[PDB]
């Protein structure tokens, strides 16, 4: 109990960085959250949006 | 059949050519909503049924 600064500033940047990694897993209203799953499906027109 | 009683035929374990269904002309609707007429030869298919 004597370390809890840096060990929380350490677990903060963790979270930080997970919440970041694991943001690329949304949609926002696409069909899928891979790229190459809507480029392989879709044409030039219609994945724009 | 009839609309209500419309048949669903399993297509599974075959090589689908969808190139040679877009490229005939005797269709009068082709609309695809979830995938591109042009993308459908380079990808696979878990079930398909008409």
Redesign the interface.
Known sequence: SALGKLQDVVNQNAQALNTLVKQLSSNFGA?SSVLNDIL????KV?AEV | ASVYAWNRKRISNCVADYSVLYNSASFSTFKCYGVSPTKLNDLCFTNVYA
Do not use: A, T, V
């Open positions: 069909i392989s499906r879709l044409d219609e």
